Paper text:
Phosphatidylethanolamine (PE), a major component of the cellular membrane across all domains of life, is synthesized exclusively by membrane-anchored phosphatidylserine decarboxylase (PSD) in most bacteria. PSD is translated as an inactive proenzyme and undergoes self-cleavage between a conserved Gly-Ser pair to become an active αβ-heterodimer. This maturation step results in the post-translational modification of the N-terminus serine to pyruvoyl in the α-subunit, which is an indispensable prosthetic group for decarboxylation activity.
Among these samples, 8PE- and 10PE-linked PSD1–287 yielded crystals, which diffracted to 2.12 Å and 2.70 Å resolution, respectively. These X-ray diffraction data were used to determine the structures shown in Fig. 4C; they are further denoted as 8PE-PSD and 10PE-PSD, respectively. The overall conformation of PSD in both PE-bound structures is highly homologous to that in apo structures (r.m.s.d. of Cαs = 0.218 Å for 8PE-PSD; 0.399 Å and 0.390 Å for the 10PE-PSD αβ-heterotetramer). In both structures, the sn-2 acyl chains extend to the hydrophobic surface of the N-terminal helical domain, where the membrane association is presumed to occur. The phosphate group of PE forms hydrogen bonds with the side chain of Tyr-137 and the backbone amide group of Val-167 in both PE-bound structures, and an additional hydrogen bond is identified with the side chain of Ser-166 in 10PE-PSD. The orientation of Pvl-254-linked PE in both structures suggests that His-144 is likely to interact with the departing carboxyl group of PS. Solid electron densities were observed in all subunits of PE connected to Pvl-254.
Residue numbers in the entry:
A (entry chain D): 254 to 287
B (entry chain C): 13 to 253
C (entry chain A): 9 to 253
D (entry chain B): 254 to 292
The structure:
């Protein structure tokens, strides 16, 4: 296995497509700066 | 069953060079778990001297393209999202009707937790199927690493839904970085059998399991002996033992 | 056998047993215990071994006020527990002596708390060992204001001198409660470390800290002396205990 | 069990008589303040 990311408040928005059980591949978009 | 003893055993087994028996256990594993050896750098299941060598297998350079948009933070591990979203003050969602303390996750480190109060979290689940190395979601300067002794519960969705504070009590390595997006924490949490955690800068953190909390620090970017990693660069991995 | 034994399961069992009210069988196990361990029930507030409804009630027994005179000289910090000194002296930077050729990190003992560790770098430490024989409550060595309490999950190794000499980082890895106080002698830490069987820790201000064992670190804070809802204890006043569980 | 006390640097001197295995009784002297206090 498990990996946990923590980001500071108001620094990123998670790509809205992603939700519980969405498939992840290294290098695909996770979040976008603000 | 005794989860540590089982893990020590699997680690003994996974690290032995048994040619034909290694290939057999690898092949059973590949078949039972639907592993996509297409994406492996060495697809011949016979190419792996030990089981662990296979578990920690590299991928083909081309197959993990890193989105180059510098406003995009990329995914750090193959698998599926467990949960993600806003940190509701100190509260992080584990599963339906199971929250956990940000402070707990960070082994009582109230300073680090404050950086992330009301922030964002992503919990990625790596199944045995998946590539078991972890890559950077963005550029970062390594500032802090904390090893946390703990339990070796399973971390599958069944266990997530049933064991309270699972990720806050399981053995793990906390990595804190300075980034263009402020502080960023990336935490490698072990599980039963697959309890060995490494980082690229420090080798294997565990085992051995000395039962105490260890903290390492590095200076800010502009200094001698600072450590910098680039978006999509391998930073660590999980193996058996 | 200290790595072989299932130390938690044994401790959960002893705690089930120690908390049952079994009249004659309680008195029997108490009496065998008293005899085998040379317990001095003379000093007990209720010396009749029959006065104790459960084994734990006996283990946590009070003493006669008069048998533990508290030195009233306010320059004197007094001993907080019956037993014997394990080791004591200067903290050599971050290094604390466990046994001959066994040091342990001050930061390790304090569960990675670098702020608290700084208070005590190059300071003074005392490790007191309570044997089953001894009274199992812990008293304040001087007046103090309670500021911080940290529960640390961990192993339940034995803490006798044999184990001290052989298990590395014993006190840094065994389950414990860290209590930080303000005193006239600056910050003072008093840390209650559990052992196999005797794994239950209480404080007077919070009741029983463990069990249950939720496997996470918990931190509580209190304000400075001059405030609503602050907690103050006096030299020689009971602050906590150990029991079976 | 075991109890561990930590004191700040230059705040106390441990009674010089005490060593490993010296017997402890609640209320007996453990250490003496480096700075004078008075009743």
């Amino acid at each position: 296995x498990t990996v946990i990311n923590l980001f500071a408040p108001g620094k990123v928005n998670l790509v809205e497509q992603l939700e519980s059980l969405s498939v992840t591949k290294i290098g695909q978009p996770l979040a976008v700066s603000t | 069953l005794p989860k540590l003893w089982l893990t020590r055993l699997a680690g003994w087994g996974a690290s032995k060079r048994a040619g034909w028996l290694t290939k057999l256990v690898i092949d059973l594993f590949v078949k039972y778990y639907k592993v996509d050896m297409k994406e492996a750098q060495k697809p011949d299941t016979a190419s792996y001297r030990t089981f662990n060598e296979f578990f920690v297998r590299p991928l083909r350079d081309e197959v993990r393209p890193i989105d180059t948009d510098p406003n995009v933070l990329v995914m750090p591990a193959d698998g599926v999202i467990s949960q993600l979203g806003k940190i509701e003050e100190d509260k992080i969602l584990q599963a339906k009707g199971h929250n956990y303390s940000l402070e707990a996750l960070l082994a009582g480190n109230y300073l680090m937790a404050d950086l992330f109060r009301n922030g964002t979290f992503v919990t990625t689940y790596l199944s045995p199927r998946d590539y078991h190395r972890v890559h950077m979601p963005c550029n970062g300067i390594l500032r802090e690493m904390i090893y946390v002794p703990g339990d070796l519960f399973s971390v599958n969705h069944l266990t997530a839904q049933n064991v309270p504070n699972l990720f806050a009590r399981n053995e793990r390595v906390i990595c804190l970085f300075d980034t263009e997006f402020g502080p960023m924490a990336q935490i490698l949490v072990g599980a039963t059998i697959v309890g060995s955690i490494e980082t690229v800068w420090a080798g294997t953190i565990t085992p051995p399991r000395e039962g105490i909390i260890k903290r390492w620090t590095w200076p800010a970017g502009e200094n001698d002996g600072s450590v910098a990693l680039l978006k999509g660069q391998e930073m660590g991995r999980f193996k058996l033992g």
